[PDB]
Amino acid sequence: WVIP
Amino acid sequence: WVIP
Amino acid sequence: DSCIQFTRHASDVLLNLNRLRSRDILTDVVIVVSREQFRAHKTVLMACSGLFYSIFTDQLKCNLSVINLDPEINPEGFCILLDFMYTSRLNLREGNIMAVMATAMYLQMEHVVDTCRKFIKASE
Amino acid sequence: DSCIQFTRHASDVLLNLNRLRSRDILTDVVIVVSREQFRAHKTVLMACSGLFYSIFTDQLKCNLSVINLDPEINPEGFCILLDFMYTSRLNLREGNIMAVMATAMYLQMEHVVDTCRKFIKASE
Ligand SMILES: N#Cc1c(Cl)ncnc1Nc1ccc2c(c1)CC(=O)N2
Ligand SMILES: N#Cc1c(Cl)ncnc1Nc1ccc2c(c1)CC(=O)N2
Ligand SMILES: [Cl-]
Ligand SMILES: [Cl-]
Ligand SMILES: [Cl-]
Numbered sequence: 579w580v581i582p
Numbered sequence: 583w584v585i586p
Numbered sequence: 587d588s589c590i591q592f593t594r595h596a597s598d599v600l601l602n603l604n605r606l607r608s609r610d611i612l613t614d615v616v617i618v619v620s621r622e623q624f625r626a627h628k629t630v631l632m633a634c635s636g637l638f639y640s641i642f643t644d645q646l647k648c649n650l651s652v653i654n655l656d657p658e659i660n661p662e663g664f665c666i667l668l669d670f671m672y673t674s675r676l677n678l679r680e681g682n683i684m685a686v687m688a689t690a691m692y693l694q695m696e697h698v699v700d701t702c703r704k705f706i707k708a709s710e
Numbered sequence: 711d712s713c714i715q716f717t718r719h720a721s722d723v724l725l726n727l728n729r730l731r732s733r734d735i736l737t738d739v740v741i742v743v744s745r746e747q748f749r750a751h752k753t754v755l756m757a758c759s760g761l762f763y764s765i766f767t768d769q770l771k772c773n774l775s776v777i778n779l780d781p782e783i784n785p786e787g788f789c790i791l792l793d794f795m796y797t798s799r800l801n802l803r804e805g806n807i808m809a810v811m812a813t814a815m816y817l818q819m820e821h822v823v824d825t826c827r828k829f830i831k832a833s834e
């Protein structure tokens with residue numbers, strides 16, 4: 579999971 | 583396009 | 587093999603599937619979550635959820651145009667997960683995390699359940 | 711928005727759509743290319759090809775279960791492009807490049823046409  |  | 591790969595292909599396919607959903611193009615099922623209804627593509631649902639994969643591979647349920655979810659399922663939680671299925675983006679907030687996690691457990695979406703558990707553990 | 715994103719989601723969806731295709735699960739069209747037939751999902755075809763997007767948004771053609779391609783289309787070229795649609799992987803070879811490029815032009819798959827042009831220009 580990432581900060582897009 | 584890339585070499586996968 | 588000796589194939590070449592187009593990096594953005596999978597993302598572009600998903601963007602177009604979401605565009606078709608938004609325009610109600612070739613949607614083939616309505617998911618009923620208490621008073622709310624959500625139109626979708628069976629193949630996308632199966633590709634994202636262990637529960638839908640089970641439902642639409644069933645010899646009788648594969649032909650249904652309406653699927654009614656358990657009355658305990660929160661419509662907003664379902665809406666957030668349906669958006670995630672079609673975009674890879676999860677709108678996870680303090681106010682919805684419990685509903686999102688419960689819905690993801692029911693839908694059998696392991697990666698979502700994982701980030702919800704991690705975000706909850708960080709706040710305790 | 712304040713969304714989080716699951717990097718592998720789009721790729722995982724496409725992998726599952728290819729698995730459904732391989733098992734002939736919820737495929738809703740057969741593409742006929744001279745003596746050969748290819749089962750697929752209309753939504754995936756539309757999401758990858760300008761030609762299929764046009765065909766399946768047509769008020770009459772959207773309901774067809776069989777689509778016959780132009781007799782000039784090479785079945786192997788179509789097979790390579792259909793595999794690319796479901797995997798992001800293009801099996802581009804000296805022996806098939808002309809057929810692949812012609813098929814991609816017909817199907818309106820701009821990125822494929824682009825790499826074919828580039829690979830051809832490098833060999834002249
Ligand atoms: N459609 C399809 C499909 C196929 Cl073909 N093969 C394998 N899994 C499929 N989908 C599916 C099954 C289980 C789960 C998910 C998706 C996400 C998750 O957390 N659990
Ligand atoms: N399905 C869908 C779709 C939608 Cl909804 N919006 C916009 N394009 C869509 N698909 C589509 C149209 C044109 C082309 C491609 C795909 C690849 C390419 O080279 N040309
Ligand atoms: Cl029904
Ligand atoms: Cl997930
Ligand atoms: Cl027909």
Ligand SMILES: [Cl-]
Pocket residue numbers: 758819820821822823
């Ligand atoms: Cl393309």
